[PDB]
Amino acid sequence: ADLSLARQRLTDESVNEAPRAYDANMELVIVAEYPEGQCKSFHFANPFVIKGVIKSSELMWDIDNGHQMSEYELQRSINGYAASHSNMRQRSAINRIPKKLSFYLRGNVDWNKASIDIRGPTGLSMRQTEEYSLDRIRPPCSYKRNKFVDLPSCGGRCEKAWYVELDGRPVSIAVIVPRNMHNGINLYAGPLLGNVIEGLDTVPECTQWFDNAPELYAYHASNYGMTMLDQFSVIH
Amino acid sequence: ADLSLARQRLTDESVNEAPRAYDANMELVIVAEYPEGQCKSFHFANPFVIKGVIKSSELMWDIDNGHQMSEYELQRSINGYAASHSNMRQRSAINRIPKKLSFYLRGNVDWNKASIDIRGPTGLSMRQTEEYSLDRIRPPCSYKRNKFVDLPSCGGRCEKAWYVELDGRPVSIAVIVPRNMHNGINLYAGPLLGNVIEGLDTVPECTQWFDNAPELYAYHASNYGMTMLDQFSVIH
Amino acid sequence: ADLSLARQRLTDESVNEAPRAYDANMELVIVAEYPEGQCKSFHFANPFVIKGVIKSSELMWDIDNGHQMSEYELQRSINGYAASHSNMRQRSAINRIPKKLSFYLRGNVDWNKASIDIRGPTGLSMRQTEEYSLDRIRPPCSYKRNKFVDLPSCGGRCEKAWYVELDGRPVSIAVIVPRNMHNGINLYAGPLLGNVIEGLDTVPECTQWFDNAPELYAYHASNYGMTMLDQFSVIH
Ligand SMILES: Nc1ncnc2c1ncn2[C@@H]1O[C@H](COP(=O)(O)OP(=O)(O)OP(=O)(O)O)[C@@H](O)[C@H]1O
Ligand SMILES: Nc1ncnc2c1ncn2[C@@H]1O[C@H](COP(=O)(O)OP(=O)(O)OP(=O)(O)O)[C@@H](O)[C@H]1O
Ligand SMILES: Nc1ncnc2c1ncn2[C@@H]1O[C@H](COP(=O)(O)OP(=O)(O)OP(=O)(O)O)[C@@H](O)[C@H]1O
Ligand SMILES: [Mg+2]
Ligand SMILES: [Mg+2]
Ligand SMILES: [Mg+2]
């Protein structure tokens, strides 16, 4: 069927190549998994720089008998990890802290410069002893580069992931995903800068709650086209 | 009264011309109207680029017997529109979805480049079949230009509106309103760039809830000076 | 002990000087104090420009019998201050409005250009009669300069504060803290601009609630290294 197949091939190529267009978004899905198997996904998109910033209050599992906990209640629990004996808790809040964090990156990403910073519970640079004096961005460990794990993007050649296991303490997150400009053109240079600046931080973020991973796969990953890897190394 | 009238005229001109000053804000009021007549207004301001980003959870009517619904409850309802059978609802959530969206723009706006993007329920570019691959900003349809409707600004010569009717599904919003630089000066060029960047994203957003449109007119529009048009084509 | 003291001195200098590094954050703590002595702290950090924006709903004391009030309830109270008879209240909401606002700035700050704008209840420039026409940023009064009060930073030579007393009406806040580039190098110039832009707005904000000031000192100030001054002029 020469021309119906040609037409199919062109439609495939148009979908596969679309992310490399000027103003086509790079895509970031962050998934937090909790001990009982619930998943919280946070989606961020931008063509130029994704800035995926998540407070530690926003990373806790926050549902309680069908009701959403307040930032105040969640921050009260987190404080006990930040500042010794700063709350009244006599048992940990490990049940609501992520077991694991998954970062799914898709599109025309500069993989040399994508930065994923797991920061401490109140947003300071992670360290044994956090302090306003030693608080910075883009620490060397944040640049994952070839530590990102290739995943199928079904023809895009443009999806990778990074996984991290937490050890029972709350964290915040700062991810910076910059656009691949390795074609030699600096989109920030010359008159185009005003247009690039106008496009930063323009796309709504979306937070979703799932009672388990299959729900996450069925109603997020496979609905929109982000391949994810489960604990058995099976892709969905 | 030559000089008391001269003084009046100068005071009029100073108020009327103020938006054209460097660091004077352009103003964006987005109003969502719901079936029972409630209005939710979202106000954004900036001198250089207004970025008016609204999640679909933030656009639902979220009050319930005097109590505000959680993002979680609202997002649970919206999911059924995004992902087939992703929630347990047996009836629609049309009662809490906007009937209509109104966008009021006032100030020294570049009307050739102002962009209003009605995006899908989870923030992806609107299309019959939304997907991470075909997710972008500043789609051609977003530039309204002469589809904006002139409204009185009482001497500013600087207010226009755009209206859109929804059809029962939830949406998110991304608006970019850039400053008119048609006097030939690029505020992003040379040393002034650092100062322009310092001014982006500095003004608090304000969300207001009204049980009906007259409340919206009385306690928002006429209080601060944004002319609005009702369903009978009367200005307030 | 020549070399153990040399080692101590070098460790002191490394902590004291760290904020002057490229990508080292400037730090902003805003503290609101309320009539019964509760404190709400808001922490913002960035290397290049801190943009510390706080809605008037976010500045009210919002805890009520251990539960967090909704933005809707808080905004309903604030509206009565913005727009005469726009709510049903027969008594003021002074109990939940700050008595006083404290701004703590630490790091490599340009003290000539740091701007602190106490804006009106709905985000407009503060004035007797607020209006969309006379809404701007960086008003002359916002530049505090030598009105900032030096505080000990324990070797950094880099902490200052500004204090303001409110008079029973709600306000919003916009603070811009730009990086000291008085070494003669414009970090926005040339190829480094893309990297500076990638770093803006990347660090999680953190809101904390304290029942009294000693809690604020014990579990925030002294935990992380921000010196604060109490009503008796004692530093903590
Ligand atoms: N179960 C799995 N676990 C881990 N990695 C996998 C798994 N399956 C595939 N991958 C990895 O994904 C990458 C792409 O594989 P493949 O070529 O099959 O995908 P594709 O559909 O062609 O999409 P793309 O256009 O991204 O290549 C490979 O590096 C592959 O090893
Ligand atoms: N009821 C209405 N419905 C739709 N458009 C209207 C209505 N009334 C006025 N307008 C439009 O608003 C625009 C400005 O009108 P007008 O000159 O009366 O306002 P103004 O007070 O002078 O303010 P400005 O300085 O913005 O002109 C005109 O294009 C006018 O047609
Ligand atoms: N109780 C106080 N009230 C107001 N200001 C104070 C108080 N104590 C100290 N300061 C001010 O703080 C500034 C720095 O003082 P000092 O040199 O003692 O601090 P330091 O530990 O050396 O830290 P730095 O490196 O910031 O100087 C001085 O201007 C000082 O007057
Ligand atoms: Mg392949
Ligand atoms: Mg006119
Ligand atoms: Mg000193």
Author numbering:
A (entry chain A), B (entry chain A), C (entry chain A): 2 to 237
Could you pull the original sentences from the published paper?
CPV are protected by a robust case (polyhedron), each a tiny crystal of viral polyhedrin, whose volume varies from 10−3 to 103 μm3 depending on the CPV type. In the alkali conditions of the insect mid-gut (pH 10.5 or greater), the crystal dissolves to release the infectious virus.
In parallel to the XFEL data collection, crystals were analysed at 100 K on a microfocus synchrotron beamline (I24, Diamond Light Source). Data from 768 crystals yielded a moderate resolution data set with a CC1/2 of 0.3 at 2.15 Å resolution. In the absence of a good molecular replacement model, these synchrotron-source data were not, in our hands, sufficient to support structure determination. Using this room temperature structure the synchrotron 100 K structure was solved trivially and refined to 2.2 Å. To accurately determine changes in unit cell dimensions between room temperature and 100 K, powder patterns were collected at Diamond Light Source, which showed a contraction of the unit cell dimension on cooling from 106.1 to 104.9 Å (values used as the cell dimensions for the XFEL and synchrotron analyses, respectively). Despite this temperature-dependent variation in the crystal lattice, the correlation in intensities between the XFEL and synchrotron data was excellent (90.9% overall). The structures are very similar (r.m.s.d. in Cα 0.26 Å after rigid body superposition). To see whether this occurs in the CPV17 polyhedra, we artificially increased the unit cell for the 100 K data to match that of the XFEL data (thereby isotropically ‘swelling’ the structure of the monomer) and performed simple restrained refinement of the resulting structure. Remarkably, these structures were then almost indistinguishable (r.m.s.d. in Cα 0.17 Å).
